[model samples]
Target: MAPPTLWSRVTKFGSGWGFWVSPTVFITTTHVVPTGVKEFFGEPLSSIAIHQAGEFTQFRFSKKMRPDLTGMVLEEGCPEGTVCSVLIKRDSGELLPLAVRMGAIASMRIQGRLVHGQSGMLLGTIPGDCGAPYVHKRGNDWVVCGVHAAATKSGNTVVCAVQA
Candidate 1:
C-alpha cells in the first residue's frame, strides 16, 4: 500500500529507504525508526485510518537499539525499491535506474579493516533521499549498495549510510 506504484522511486518508510527482501522482512538502519516511532505519518501523526489501512508500519526500538543495522518485520510486504548490493560487480558504466545512483565510499582510515561510505549526490543531497536505495546494475539484475542513513548537519548532503 506504500509503494507509489509497481514501478517507482518512492517508498513509505516512515521516511527513507529500506530493502524489502520478502513479504515481511525488511533491512535498514535502526536509526531510521527513531525519527518517527512515537510520531504520526499522516496529518503530522499516526491515526486509526492510516493504521487500519496499513499505510505506515509502526516500529518499536528499544533503549538499547544498536547503531549498526536493523531488520524489520512489517505487517505487509514492501515490493518497491527493494534492491540488492550483494555483489559489488557493477562497473562504473552500469545502467543505474532513475531512482538509483552510484554512491562512492568517500573515505576510510587504515586502522583495522577497510571502512568506506560517502556523503550525498549519489545520495549526498536532499533529505528525502535518506532511506533511498543506492542501486547499481549487476548484469541483468539490480543490486543495492546502501541505505541512505542520514544527512549532514546542513541537510544538503547525505553523510552516511547503512551498508549492505
Candidate 2:
C-alpha cells in the first residue's frame, strides 16, 4: 500500500526477506525498507514494520537506506519452521535436490510462494521484489553453488545463492 500523494507504490507481499541479527536487530536489502519511508510516513508507521511469524515471534523491519542492503531490529527471534518448501523447479541455477540438504532445505516466502534455496541461507529470489535476500554471515557462509525449481519443474537450476 502506497501513499495517495505518490503516483507509484510497490507491492507489499514478498517485498523483501531478512532475519534477526540479534533479538533486536535485523539485516536485509535497502530496497525493502527505503530511506524516505520514515519521512513519508510517521512514527509507528514511519520506519519499521513488525511482522508475525508465530504466536511468540514478531519481526521488526526498518527502512532501508542503501540500494541493496539494510539492517533491522527484531522484537524477538523468529520461530522455528519459518523456513518452508516453495520450490517447483529451477530456471535460474544448478538443480539442487532436496535430499542434498538431508531432506530439509532453506526456502523463502516469495509472492506468497515458498521458493527453495541452497542450505539454510537465503540465496535465491524470484526476480524483482523477491524479498530482500537475507545474506547472513555464519561461521561458514559458503556460496550456493546451485538451485532448482518446484516439483513441477524442480530440476531447472537458475540462481547463484551468493548467500544461498
Candidate 3:
C-alpha cells in the first residue's frame, strides 16, 4: 500500500477539524464535543465529513471523550523546539497550512487521563481552527504530534495543542 498523504487523514467536525488516528477513530478538541456521542449539535457523527485528496468521506463513529482540559492521547509526542506545521481554517472555508515551532511541555491532571500540553507558534487563528493537526517532519514522513486546542496571548498567536 502507498503511504497515506498528510492531509488525507484530516477531517471536518461540525465547524472544527480533526484527523484519523485509526480507520475507525479520530482526534479532535473536547470543546467541540460536549458529553455525548449520539450527536453533535443535533447532527449524528455520520453527518461529519473527512477530507481526502479533494473529496469528503465518512467513517463509523465509535466513541468520544468528555469535555476536559485536553483531548486525545499521544503515542509519541514531539519535544520542545521541534518545528512543525499546523492547519488553520480560513474564512474562505479552506485549510491554511502554517509552520509552527513547538515550545515547552507541561503535564496536567484530567478526569481520568494524564495529558500534556504543548505550546506552538502560529501567525494567527480562526474560530473553527480548533482540532487541527499539529504535525512535524520525521525522517521522510510526517508525524502527527498533537491537535490544536486554543490560542493564548503572545506577541503573535501562540497555539496550545494537546500533546500526544
Candidate 4:
C-alpha cells in the first residue's frame, strides 16, 4: 500500500508599502476625527462641561494609539525576529493633528525605537498592554530601530523592517 502524501500548502502573504500604509492610515484617521479637533479647539470654543463631553468622545474614539505615517515608506527590509531601522517622512503637515496624539510634533522629526513586529497591515500598538516595537532616534529624519519578532499566531510581538 502506498502511503498518503499531502502537498505542501502555500499561502501568499501581503508585502511592501501597502502592508503598512493601509492600516496606519485607517487607524490614524479614525483617531484624528475626534481628538485632534476637540482637544485643540475645545478650550476656547466650549465651557468646562462641554469641553469634558468633547474630551470624553475624543478618548472614546482615539483609544487606539497608532502613528500617522502620512504616506511615508520604510526605507529598508527587516526579516522576522530581527531588529531593523524604519525611516519615514511626512507628506504634509495636515497629518500633524494625528501625529500629535502619538507625541509627534509638526516639522519636527519623531522616531520610535525597539518597536515590536506584530502581524497585520497596520502600524499600531495595543495601548498600555504592549510596548512600542520601535525606538526613536533624534535628528532631522525620524529613524526607528528595534528587534523584530518571528511570526506566531498567539504572540503579538514580531519584528520586521520596512522598505521603499
CA-lDDT, candidates in order? 0.36, 0.29, 0.57, 0.21
Residue 61 of model 3 has an lDDT of 44
Sort by TM-score, top down from the best: 3, 1, 2, 4
In TM-score terms, which candidate is top?
A: 3
Which has the higher TM-score value, candidate number 2 or candidate number 3?
Answer: 3
Residues 30-76, model 2: lDDT tens digits: 33444334332233543555432211112343643233322322211
Ranking by lDDT: 3, 1, 2, 4
TM-score of each: 0.40, 0.25, 0.64, 0.20
Better of 2 and 4 by lDDT: 2
lDDT of 3 by residue, 47-141 (tens): 65432211112233444322222222333447788887785555465657778777876653332444566767653675578777777655655
Weakest lDDT window of 10 consecutive positions for candidate 1: 47-56
Best by lDDT: 3
lDDT for 76 in candidate 4 is 32
TM match of model 4 to true structure: 0.20
Which stretches of model 1 miss by more than 4 angstroms?
1-10, 34-116, 120-125, 152-160
lDDT per residue (tens digit) for residues 1-164 in model 1: 12222113224454444444332234443344445345432222332222111112222322222233333222122123333322111123222233322344555322233334444432224444445454444454444445555555664444334332
TM-score, predicted candidate 2 vs. hidden true structure = 0.25
- Worst lDDT run of 10 residues, candidate 2, spans 1-10
Q: Write the per-residue lDDT of candidate 4 for residues 79-155, one digit (tens) a residue.
A: 33332222211222111101111211112111323322223222222221111223222343333322122223443
In terms of lDDT, the poorest run of 10 residues in model 4 is 2-11
